[PDB]
Amino acid sequence: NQLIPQAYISNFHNRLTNEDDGIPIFTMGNAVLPDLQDQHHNPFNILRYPKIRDTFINGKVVSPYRLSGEAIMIPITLDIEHMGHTIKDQFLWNYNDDSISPEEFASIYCKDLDMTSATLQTQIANIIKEQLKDLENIAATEIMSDLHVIINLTCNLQDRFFEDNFQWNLNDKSLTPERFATSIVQDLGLTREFIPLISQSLHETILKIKKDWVDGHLIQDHVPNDAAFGYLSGIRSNWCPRVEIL
Amino acid sequence: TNWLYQHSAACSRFNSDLFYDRVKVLLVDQQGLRDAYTNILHIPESTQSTTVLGWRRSKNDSPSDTSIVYETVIHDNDLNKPKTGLSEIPKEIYEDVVDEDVLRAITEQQNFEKCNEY
Amino acid sequence: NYEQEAQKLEEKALRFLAKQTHPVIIPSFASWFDISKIHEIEKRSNPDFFNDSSRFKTPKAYKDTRNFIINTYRLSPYEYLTITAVRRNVAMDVASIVKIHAFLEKWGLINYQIDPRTKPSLIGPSFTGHFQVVLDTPQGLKPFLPEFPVNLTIKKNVYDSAQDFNALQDESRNSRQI
Amino acid sequence: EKALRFLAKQTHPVIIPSFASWFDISKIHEIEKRSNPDFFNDSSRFKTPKAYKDTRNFIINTYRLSPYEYLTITAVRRNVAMDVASIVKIHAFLEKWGLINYQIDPRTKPSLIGPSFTGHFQVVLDTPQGLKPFLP
Amino acid sequence: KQKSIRQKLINNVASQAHHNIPYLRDSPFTAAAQRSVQIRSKVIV
Amino acid sequence: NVFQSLPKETARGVDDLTRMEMALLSGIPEEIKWSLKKYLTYSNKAPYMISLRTLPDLLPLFKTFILPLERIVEGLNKSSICDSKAMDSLQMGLNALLILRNLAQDTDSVQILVKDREIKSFILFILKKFQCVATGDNKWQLYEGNATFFNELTHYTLDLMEAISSYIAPAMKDDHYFQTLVSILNYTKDRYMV
Amino acid sequence: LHPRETLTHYLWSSKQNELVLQGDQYFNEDAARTSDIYSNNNNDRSLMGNISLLYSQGRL
Amino acid sequence: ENNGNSVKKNWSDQEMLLLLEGIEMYEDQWEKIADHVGGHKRVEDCIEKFL
Amino acid sequence: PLNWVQGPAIFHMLTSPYTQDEIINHEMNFLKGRLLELQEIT
DSSP states (O other): OOOOSSOOOOOTHHHOOOOOOOOOOOOOOOOOOOOSSOOOOOOGGGGGGGGHHHHHHSHHHHOOOOOOSSEEEEEEEEEEEEEEEEEEEEEEEESSSSSSSSSHHHHHHHTTTTTTOOOOOHHHHHHHHHHHHHHHHSOOOOSSSOOOOEEEEOSSSOOEEEEEEEEEOOOOOOSOHHHHHHHHHHHHTTTTHHHHHHOOOOHHHHHHHHHHHHSSSSOOOOOOOOOSSSSSSSSOOOOOOOOOOO | SSHHHHHHHHHHHHHHHHHHHHHHIIIISSSSSSSEEEEOEEGGGSSOOEEEEEEEEEOOOSOOOOHHHHEEEEEOOOOOOOOOOTTOTTTTTTGGGGGGGHHHHHHHHHHHHOOOOO | OOHHHHHHEEEEEESSOOOOOOOOEEEEEOOOOOSSOHHHHHHSSOOOOOOOOSTTTTHHHHHHHHHHHHHHHSSSSOOOOOOOHHTTTSOOOOHHHHHHHHHHTTTTOOOOOOOOOGOOOOSSSOOOOOOEEEEOTTTTTSSSOOOOOOOOOOOEEEEESSSSTTTTSSSGGGOOOO | OHHHHHHHHOOOOOOOOSSHHHHOSSSOOOOHHHGGGTTTTOOSOOOHHHHHHHHHHHHHHHHHTTSSOOOOHHHTTTTTTSSSSHHHHHHHHHHTTTTTSSOOOOOOOOOEOOOOSSOOOOOOEEEETTBBBOOO | HHHHHHHHHHHHHHOOOOSSSSHHSSSSSHHHHHHHHTTOOOOOO | OOOOOOOOGGGGOOOHHHHHHHHHHHHHHHHHHHHHOOOOOOHHHHHTTTTTTTTTTHHHHHHHTTTTHHHHGGGGGGGOSSSSHHHHHHHHHHHHHHHHHHHTSSSSHHHHHHOTTTHHHHHHHHHHHEEEEEEEEOOOOOGGHHHHHHHHHHHHHHHHHHHHTTTTSSOOOOOOHHHHHHTTTTTOOOOOTT | OOOOOOOOHHHHHHHHHHHHHHTOSSOSSHHHHHHHTTTTTTTTOOOSSSSSTTTTTOOO | SSSSOOSOOOOOOOHHHHHHHHHTTTOOOHHHHHHHHHHSSOOHHHHHOOO | OOOOOOOOOOOOOOOOOOSSGGGGHHHEEEHHHHHHHHHHOO
8 A cells, every 4th residue: 555656647738738837839945846855755745845746636647648771850840829829849850760650640749738639630740741741852962062051040949049150061960960959058058958949940950051952052152151260261260159038 | 469369268268157157057056957848857967877887785694684775885996087988999090109008008098997897 | 085075975976866755666577677778679679779770860869868768757757758748858850759668668667557556565585685786976076186996875775674665665664653 | 380379378287198198289190190080181171181280279278278177069169160060070089088178177077957867766576466676 | 373374374385386486397397297287188170 | 636547457557468478578588487387378278369360479479489499409319408598498499389289279370370381390390300210210319318308399299280281281292291200100109199 | 429518417407306306395294383494494585475475365 | 551662573572462362362364463463563574473 | 459358267276286187176166167157147
C-alpha cells in the first residue's frame, strides 16, 4: 500500500492553457520544485509545492498511445487557429523519412493538446502535406563553390526576439546548424526551448539561400561583409548575438 | 595601432560579461529553472555528475544481518588535471610531432582519460 | 586546504544531487538498460544513428535525447510523459524522436502503466552489502586550486529490509513509531 | 608587427601542458596542417592559411588576457571575420590539445541547461511474482 | 502449533525443489524430465 | 480524485503474453528460461492460443534457439560441453524444439512450419547426423557421453517429420527424408519409433 | 584424443554432480525438529525468505 | 508498557509474551498478532520470530 | 484488435512428479472440474 502508481497522470493540456507557463502552443525553501530538496521520504511534503498539487487536483488519467541514406531536413510551420486558441509552433521534417505519416503525427499532436477533434488531424497534415510537397526538391540541393554568405537571423519566442549576424559557408557541412544553435544557448544561458527554434529558423534560412541558388540561380558571391580581420583583407567581425526584449 | 588590443580586450570583457550573465540567472538567483511543458527543475549540466562508474559490493559487518546499505560516492583521478581530450585524436595524427616525450605526454593524458573507470 | 577543498566539494555535491522521493518501477525484461552506455538492443532498434547515414543521426545525439527523455521521466515518475513536451525542447526531426519514444515505451522504461499496491515484494539479492554507485566529479564543482584523488560518499542510507527499500524508507519509521 | 606590443603589454603569463609542446606560436607545422587542412589546401578563396594564422593567434592571445575564464566560441566570434563552420574547427582543435581551456576555473565553462542526472536513484523491478530490488 | 507451521513451511518450499534451486534445475536429468512431462500427445492422421 | 479512475486491466503492468514475448526478445536468459517454460506450459495446455496462424511473428523467435544447435550436433562426436553455459544454450534449443513439436499437431500452425524451407534443412541435418549412427558410420563417431542429449533430440524430430510428411506428399525419387528414414528403420528397437 | 576438454568437463561435471547429490540434507527427522534451520541461517538464505511469498498466497 | 520499543529484531519479553498471548488468543491472523505485539512489528517478522 | 480476455485454466499441480500415472487422476478430476464449470456458461 501507500504507493503512487507509475502512470495515469497527464496534466499537460492544463499547463498548455495555464496562462502563466510560457508555452507558445495555446493562447486561449524558495524552489518551485523539489528536484534539489529532499522530503524525508514522506510524500505529503510534495503537496506543499504549488505546481505539484496543481497536477494532483487538476490532473487527469490517460491511456498510453500505442504505435534512407541522407536525411532531408525541412522546417514545417503549423499555424492553425482553432476555437479562439491557436496552434503555433515549428518543427523540422525528415523528408527522406516516411516512417511516420503526417496524419499519424497529427493524431499524436492533438492528443497531447487534448483536442482530438479529428479535423485538426486532417488540417494539420494537409498543411504538412502541402509544405512537404512545396519544398520537396528545394532542400535537396548540392551547393558548391563557397557561397560564404552572411546571415541575419531572427527568432520569435514570446516577445524575446533573438538576433545574430554571422558569416555562414553553406559549402562545408561540418557545422550542424542544430549544433550552432546549441553553442549560442550554452554561452548565452538560455532555456532549452531555443535549441529547436534557432535550428528550425536556420534551416528555413538555409533553404532560402538554397532557393536563390536553384530557383533564380543568382550566385551573388560578392564580398560578404566583414570587419577586415579574417577572409577579406581590407585594412588588417560582423556582429554578436543578442536576445532583444521588445 | 590600438586595434588588436582593443578588440581582444573587448572580447575578454564580453567573455567576462557573458559569464556574469550566465552564472547569476541559473545558479545564484533561484538555483535552477522550471520547464513549462513538464514540472522539471532545469539545471546546468556542469554540476550534475553526468557519468557513473561501476558498483562496489561489500557486506555488513555482523553475520546473520538483514540491513541493506545502499549509498553513493563520487570519484576522480587526482582532481587537478583537466579533461582536454587527446583520446579524441587518432593515433596517426601526433606521429610527426617533433619530439618523443610529447608522444608520451599525449598518450599519458590519453591513458589518464582512459582510466575514467576506477 | 586539501581536507577543506574535499569538504567544500562534498558540500556543493550535496547541494546538487536531486534526492529521490519516488520509487521507480521498470519491468523485469527491461533490466538490460544503463544510463551511461548505449545497449545493443538500442543499436539494432534505432540503427539510423549508428549507421551514420545522415549528419543529424549520431550515437551521441541519440544518447543525449535518450537520457533526456528518461531523466525528465524519472524525476516526474507519476506523470505520463508526452511527445509534445519533449519535442519543444530537443532539436531533432519528428520522425526519429517518435522512434526513440516508442522504443522506450515499448520496453516500459518510460510510461509503465502499473499500480504497485496490488503486487507483493521479494528479497532477491543479498540482504547485506554496502551498495555504492560510483559517480564522477562534475566539472564545475571541482576546486579551483591554483598551482588529490579524493572520493567522497554523498548519501549514506541503511535499509532494515527490502520492504523499506521498495517503499524508500530509511528507518524514518522511528519518528512515526505508530 | 601588430601582436608584438599586444603580447607585451596586457597578457597574463602562459600556462601550457606537456602534450602541447609541439605547438609553434610563430608558424604552422604538420600537426595543424593535418588536423584542419581546409585552411591550407584551397577549400575556398576565403580560408587562406594567412587567415588561419591571424585567427589562431587571436584565439590564443585573448586567453592570455583571461586565463581563468573559459574563452568561449561566441565571444571570439565578435572580432573574428570567419565562417562559424571554421571558427569551431580551430577552437575545438586548440582545446583538444589543451591550449586555450586547460587551466581555467571549472565553473566558468558554459554547460547546457537541462534536467538532473538520475543514476544514484533506487530502482525496483516489476518481477512477474514480486517487487524485488535492483541491487547488482 | 509451530510444528504445524513448520510442516506447512518445509512441505511448501521443498515440494517443488526444482524451480528455484539453480543447480537442480540446470541438471541434465531434471531439465529432461520437466521437458518429458510436457510432451503433448501425437494426433493420429 | 485522480487516483480512483485507474484502469483495472493495466494496473498490474504488462500482460503475461507480452511479458513472455519481451523476455525472449531481451537477452535475459532466466527470463528466456521463464518464458520458454511458460511457452511449453501453454503449448501443452492451450495450443490454440500460441498457434502460428494466430501469432505469425512467433516462428523466428524460436528459430534463434534451434538453428545454433546444429553446431552442437556437429561437435557432439566428442566431449564438447565443458561448462554449464553451452549446456544452457543446448537446453534452450531443446526446449524450443518441443514447443514447435507440440504446436505441429494443430493443422493451422503446421503449413506455416512447412513453408519454412529452413527447418526442413535442419531436420535433414539431424537425420544425416543420425544416419552416421543408424548405419554405424565412423564418420561422426558419436561420443557415448553425448548420446542422451541426442536420443530425446531425435525423438521430437521424428514427431515433426511425422506431421509434415503429408505436405511433402509429392515425394521425390531421391527423397532424402525417404532415403534416411529407411536406413533409420533398419536400426531401432523402439516400438514407438517404428 | 583430448585430455583437456574431457577433464575440464570432468572437473565441472563432477563438481556439478557433487552439488546435485548435496541438495538433499536439511530434511531429516531431528534436523527439522531442532531450530538450526530457521535461526541465524541467513548464510543459508534458502528458506525463511519465502515467508514474504508463502504468506502472500495464504500458504502459512 | 505503552511506548514504542527500540530498533527491531530485539524482541523483548513484553513483545514475546504479547506474541504468545495472541497465538493462544487467535491461532491465526498475524495482522491481529502484530498489533497485539504493539503494531511496530511487521507480519513478516513475527512469523520469522515464531519459527 | 485488442481483446482483454481471461486466460484458460491451466492445470498446474503443486507437487511435481515425473511419471505420468500420478498425474492422470488429478487431471481427470481437473477435466471434470473445468468442463462442468464451463458447461453452465453455455
